[PDB]
Design a protein around this ligand. Structure first.
Ligand code: PA5
Ligand code: PA5
Ligand code: MN
Ligand code: MN
Lengths: 189, 189
C-alpha cells in the first residue's frame, strides 16, 4: 500500500525539473485572454512566442497528497499588457496553494468569485500563500524569465473556463515606463 | 469570509523567514536519539549546541490548508553519527509532504510503520516527495548548514512518540572518511 518516496533535481536557474511532464503555452494558445486583440493577432502571426512552460510532477488525485510544478514565464507584452499565465480557480474550492519565487521579477494577481482583487509582488525568495477560494494568475513584469515553484494538493483540480469566460477584474500593464494594476475594461460588472 | 493572500520573504542563504515562529532544538532535547550515548552526554555537558532551528508559517489545523517551514540543520557529529532532526510520522498518517533543498549537503531518511526504509540524498535544488504514511528525518552530512524548505498539510500534525522509542531502522555515519548508511544497532520490532 505504501508508495515509493523520491527526489528530483530542479535547476533553479532554468526551472527545468529533470524527467517531469512538460507543457508549453504559446500566444496562439491564449486566444481571448489579452485586452488588445489586434496586438495579439499581430504577435501571433509575426512570431507566436512561448508565453510560458510548466514542468509538473503530479500524483493520483487523492486527498492528503501533494503535487509540484515549476513555471517559466517568459518576458514580453501584448500591447501594453505584460505576459501572464491563463489563470484558474481550483475545482475544489477548499484547497490552498504555496508558490516559491526562484528567479526574475513578477507577481500574482488574485480574485474571489465575487471580484475582489489582490496583487502580491514576487522576487527571488518570495513565498506566496494562495488561500482557499481565490483564482490566481502570475505576471512577469521584468525583462528576464520569471521562474517559480508551486506546491498544491493533488486533488485541487483546475477551473479555467470561468477565467476564460470572464477574465480577471484587474490588468497589469506598463504605462510611461511605470508598472500599473488597473481595471480590466472588459470585466463582468 | 476569505483569508487574505500574503507574501513573505525567505532568505535562501540563511533560512530566515521574517516574522515567522522560530523554534530551536538543542542537543539536550534529543536524549535517547543517538547511538553513542556517551558522546551524547559529553557534547551536551561541554556545549549543548543547537542541532537545528525551524522557521514555520502555520495555519489553523484545517484540511486543504498548507504550512511551510524552513529548517537550518547545523553541521556536527555525535560520535560517528551526523546531526539530524528528531523525525516523525504525521498524526494524520495519510498526509504527504514536499521538501526543497536550499543550501548545503544532506539527505532524508524515511520509514514506514512496519519498517521499510529509504535514503534520499539532497543537495541544492533537490526536491523530495514524502509519501503519505512515511516517517521522515533529515541529516546533514557536510561542513556547512543544511538548509531546506518544506510544505505540508496544515492538519498533518506530528507523531514524535513512535520514533523516540523505536528509532529509525538505519543510521547515517562517517567512517574512515566515508559517509555510510547502515543498520541501526538499537533497533527491534
Ligand atoms: O498550480 C498552479 O497554480 C501553477 O503550477 C499553474 O498551473 C502554472 O503556473 C501555469 O498556470 P495556469 O495553470 O494558470 O496555466
Ligand atoms: O514539517 C516537517 O516535516 C519539517 O518542517 C520538520 O518538522 C522540521 O524539519 C523539524 O524536524 P522535526 O519536526 O522532526 O523535529
Ligand atoms: Mn493553482
Ligand atoms: Mn513532516
Amino acid at each position: 500500500m505504501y508508495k515509493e518516496p523520491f527526489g528530483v533535481k530542479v535547476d533553479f536557474e532554468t526551472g527545468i525539473i529533470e524527467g517531469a511532464k512538460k507543457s508549453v503555452r504559446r500566444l496562439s494558445d491564449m486566444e481571448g485572454y489579452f485586452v488588445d486583440e489586434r496586438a495579439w493577432k499581430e504577435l501571433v502571426e509575426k512570431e507566436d512566442p512561448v508565453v510560458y512552460e510548466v514542468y509538473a510532477v503530479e500524483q493520483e488525485e487523492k486527498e492528503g497528497d501533494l503535487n509540484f510544478a515549476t513555471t517559466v514565464l517568459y518576458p514580453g507584452k501584448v500591447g501594453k499588457e505584460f505576459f501572464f499565465t491563463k489563470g484558474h480557480f481550483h475545482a475544489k474550492l477548499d484547497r490552498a496553494e504555496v508558490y516559491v519565487a526562484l528567479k526574475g521579477k513578477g507577481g500574482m494577481l488574485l480574485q474571489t468569485p465575487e471580484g475582489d482583487a489582490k496583487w502580491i509582488s514576487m522576487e527571488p525568495g518570495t513565498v506566496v500563500y494562495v488561500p482557499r477560494g481565490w483564482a490566481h494568475r502570475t505576471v512577469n513584469i521584468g525583462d528576464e524569465p520569471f521562474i517559480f515553484l508551486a506546491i498544491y494538493p493533488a486533488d485541487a483540480g483546475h477551473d479555467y473556463g470561468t477565467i476564460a469566460e470572464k477574465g480577471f477584474s484587474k490588468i497589469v500593464i506598463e504605462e510611461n515606463g511605470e508598472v500599473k494594476v488597473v481595471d480590466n475594461p472588459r470585466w463582468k460588472k
